[PDB]
Amino acid sequence: KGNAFKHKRALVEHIIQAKADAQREKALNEEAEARRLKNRAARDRRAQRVAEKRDALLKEDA
Amino acid sequence: AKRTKKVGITGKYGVRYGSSLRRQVKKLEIQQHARYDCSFCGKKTVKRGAAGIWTCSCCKKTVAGGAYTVSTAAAATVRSTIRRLREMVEA
Amino acid sequence: QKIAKTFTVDVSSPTENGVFDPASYAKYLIDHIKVEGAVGNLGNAVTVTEDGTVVTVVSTAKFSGKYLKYLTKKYLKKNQLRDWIRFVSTKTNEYRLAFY
RNA sequence: UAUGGAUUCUUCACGGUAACGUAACUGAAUGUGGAGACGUCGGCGCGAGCCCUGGGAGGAGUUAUCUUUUCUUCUUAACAGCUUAUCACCCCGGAAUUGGUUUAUCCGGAGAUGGGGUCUUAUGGCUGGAAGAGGCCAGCACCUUUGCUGGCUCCGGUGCGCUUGUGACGGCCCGUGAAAAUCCACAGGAAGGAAUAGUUUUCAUGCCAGGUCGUACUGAUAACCGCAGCAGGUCUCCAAGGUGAACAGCCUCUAGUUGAUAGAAUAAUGUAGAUAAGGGAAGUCGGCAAAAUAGAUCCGUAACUUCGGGAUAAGGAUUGGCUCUAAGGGUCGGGUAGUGAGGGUCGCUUGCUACAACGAUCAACUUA
RNA sequence: UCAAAUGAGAACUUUGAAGACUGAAGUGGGGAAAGGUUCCACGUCAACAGCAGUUGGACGUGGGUUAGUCGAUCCUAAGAG
RNA sequence: GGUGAACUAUGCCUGAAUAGGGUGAAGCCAGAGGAAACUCUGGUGGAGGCUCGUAGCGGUUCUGACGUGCAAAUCGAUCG
């Protein structure tokens, strides 16, 4: 309605934008979280790669 | 974009009259060309058929009103006054 | 589909007086039939079935016997044999000659 | 007046949820609505005609050369039966992710989307009427009356095209935009009706009868009037093609004209035109008169303003022919599973498989 | 503008042969008022048709408008009484 | 003592007429900025006792022609 568009084929290139960003952005979010997981846990072995200052002292004397 | 600067809807008149005249009466246009509410459906269709004729299609009402607004404040105070004095005579 | 169209014309009418060669008219066309652009571009879509007495063309190319009339008019203009022959229609795509 | 049906002891129909529907299926006073029956303007859409064009066919002209050439026939009344719309209406439904949606912004929980249906038939289409009509040619037959004898009347397309009727919006008014004439339909259940009949016969078909006038013509530089067969006046309606934005100009075809005492010479004279070196308003009361410009395309613009103007301010640049290039749309799809709703065929993802980026085709004049 | 005819008569009467115009918001087709037999067919040219006129809407004659279905009268408006 | 509103001035009721252009008024949307207020920007959209300008309608002028005219009020240019 407003103006926001040129003509038919230009708007078809815009359909390639809507397609391209639904696909190529939504799948990008999904793979983003899917790659966050368990590198979480590599950072756990990291924070237990220098605070085992606390894990090398205390519990299992018995 | 924005069409007119200060002339607004009376840009149909342009440079035609004493500018005091256009300056007053453009407001009168704004008054008589507003849409108001039916209080019975809640919607709004009330608008001037004539000066004191305030037409309405949403739930189909029409009130003899003022000239360019529907109700004048005189009708509001004779309203509140016949009503309130009605609550001073009836009450 | 590829049906050769039949156009049936009697040409005996001056030839019976010996004053006309239908081999000169079918020869006159066999270089001149405006099929596919070039006149006489007549690669095996046509039949030139003359007799000397009746010529009939059965040809799967774009043709009308009214264009065959247009082939007569330049001929009888050219040899100037107009005004002894009308290219008369028996019926549709059926024609004949005269002698008068 | 007959006929047939109707509708009934459910006295004077059926159904659908409602949509709504039919060949039917009584009614005083009192009302009732509707029609008639009335503003303008704007866009937008749609009907009808015209104009434009192709193929097919019959008719005719061109032709040194070209010229499938330039033209010609290809029609369907009132009236019947079918079909057909905006709009509208009832089920389902509850909506915010708000959605639906105009060209131009509108609507929906007082139910939107949407999914179902119900409905006016404007309108248009189909068929009949109504082909025999008409027409178109083509052929003979001869005083031939001219009679005979055929054929054709087919399929297109196209549109910011023209003319016209619609739809639905939108504008405007301290302006808000006829009358009667007429006919319904519903109350009304007055009043009257079936039971062996009953019947309105808004259901059908079937009888007869259609005052009086007016009606030809002109409608105008001769049928009107002006004193006149007077260059004066006199109300209404229809528009081919080129050209061009244009009903502007100009030409061309149909339509229709082709009428203005005649003749011979060409002197001033005027009248009606044009042309002029050079200079340019001195001339003239006075640039009277005359001269100059101009369309389109791109640039630019002063003062003042009551802000809107001024402004086209003013003032700058462009305009042949040809051969090319770009953009600017529409219909159809996206199968080896013999697959779907079937169960000559049949279609989506289509590579009884159940369903997942595009390509095939027709079409413009528009700028660059 | 040319040939023919016709008549004693052809500038002015016909027919052929040409060129032009309006060019369609027509010199087109018409219709309303208005006119009214002009309409149309014939015999004629006194006189007109400012030359002519053999021709006219000229002179003598005839012919011509068809309605249940189309307008009037219905209605009412302005108005009238 | 009679007649004219057919000419002309005025009212009412029924009817008829008006190319092609410039103009962009309002409405509404799209974007940007701003906290909003608002600010622009891009549109849509088609206003005007608007304008050019045609049909039209009048007549300002040349003091045009005429000036016993086609004319007891014509014709030319011109204008609004």
Curated annotation (Swiss-Prot), chain A:
UniProt region (Disordered), positions on chain: 37-62
Subcellular location: Cytoplasm
Location in chain, cross-link Glycyl lysine isopeptide (Lys-Gly) (interchain with G-Cter in ubiquitin): 19, 59
Source organism, top-level taxon: Eukaryota
Family: Belongs to the eukaryotic ribosomal protein eL19 family.
Self-association and partners: Component of the large ribosomal subunit (LSU). Mature yeast ribosomes consist of a small (40S) and a large (60S) subunit. The 40S small subunit contains 1 molecule of ribosomal RNA (18S rRNA) and 33 different proteins (encoded by 57 genes). The large 60S subunit contains 3 rRNA molecules (25S, 5.8S and 5S rRNA) and 46 different proteins (encoded by 81 genes). eL19 lies in close proximity to the binding site for eukaryotic initiation factor eIF4G.
Other facts noted in the record for this chain: Present with 97700 molecules/cell in log phase SD medium.
Role of this protein: Component of the ribosome, a large ribonucleoprotein complex responsible for the synthesis of proteins in the cell. The small ribosomal subunit (SSU) binds messenger RNAs (mRNAs) and translates the encoded message by selecting cognate aminoacyl-transfer RNA (tRNA) molecules. The large subunit (LSU) contains the ribosomal catalytic site termed the peptidyl transferase center (PTC), which catalyzes the formation of peptide bonds, thereby polymerizing the amino acids delivered by tRNAs into a polypeptide chain.
Name used for this protein in its record: Large ribosomal subunit protein eL19A
Provenance organism: Saccharomyces cerevisiae (strain ATCC 204508 / S288c)
Gene behind this protein: RPL19A
Portion of the full sequence shown: 128 to 189 of 189
Curated annotation (Swiss-Prot), chain B:
Molecular function, one GO term: structural constituent of ribosome
ZnF (C4-type) residues: 38-59
An annotated GO cellular component: cytosol
Residues carrying Phosphoserine: 39
Highest taxon of the lineage: Eukaryota
Further comment: Present with 44600 molecules/cell in log phase SD medium. There are 2 genes for eL43 in yeast.
Subunit-level organization: Component of the large ribosomal subunit (LSU). Mature yeast ribosomes consist of a small (40S) and a large (60S) subunit. The 40S small subunit contains 1 molecule of ribosomal RNA (18S rRNA) and 33 different proteins (encoded by 57 genes). The large 60S subunit contains 3 rRNA molecules (25S, 5.8S and 5S rRNA) and 46 different proteins (encoded by 81 genes).
Function noted in UniProt: Component of the ribosome, a large ribonucleoprotein complex responsible for the synthesis of proteins in the cell. The small ribosomal subunit (SSU) binds messenger RNAs (mRNAs) and translates the encoded message by selecting cognate aminoacyl-transfer RNA (tRNA) molecules. The large subunit (LSU) contains the ribosomal catalytic site termed the peptidyl transferase center (PTC), which catalyzes the formation of peptide bonds, thereby polymerizing the amino acids delivered by tRNAs into a polypeptide chain.
Name of the protein: Large ribosomal subunit protein eL43A
Species assigned in the record: Saccharomyces cerevisiae (strain ATCC 204508 / S288c)
Gene name for this UniProt entry: RPL43A
Swiss-Prot record, chain C:
Presence of the UniProt keyword Ribonucleoprotein in the record: yes
GO cellular component, one term: cytosolic large ribosomal subunit
Main localization, broad class: cytoplasm
Keyword Membrane: no
Entry keywords, A to Z: Cytoplasm, Ribonucleoprotein, Ribosomal protein
Superkingdom, natural source: Eukaryota
Cell compartments where the protein resides: Cytoplasm
GO molecular function: RNA binding; structural constituent of ribosome
A biological process from GO: cytoplasmic translation
UniProt similarity note: Belongs to the eukaryotic ribosomal protein eL22 family.
Task of the protein: Component of the ribosome, a large ribonucleoprotein complex responsible for the synthesis of proteins in the cell. The small ribosomal subunit (SSU) binds messenger RNAs (mRNAs) and translates the encoded message by selecting cognate aminoacyl-transfer RNA (tRNA) molecules. The large subunit (LSU) contains the ribosomal catalytic site termed the peptidyl transferase center (PTC), which catalyzes the formation of peptide bonds, thereby polymerizing the amino acids delivered by tRNAs into a polypeptide chain.
Note: Present with 60400 molecules/cell in log phase SD medium.
Subunit structure: Component of the large ribosomal subunit (LSU). Mature yeast ribosomes consist of a small (40S) and a large (60S) subunit. The 40S small subunit contains 1 molecule of ribosomal RNA (18S rRNA) and 33 different proteins (encoded by 57 genes). The large 60S subunit contains 3 rRNA molecules (25S, 5.8S and 5S rRNA) and 46 different proteins (encoded by 81 genes).
Name used for this protein in its record: Large ribosomal subunit protein eL22A
Lineage per the UniProt record: Eukaryota, Fungi, Dikarya, Ascomycota, Saccharomycotina
Gene: RPL22A
Part of the full-length chain shown: 9 to 108 of 121
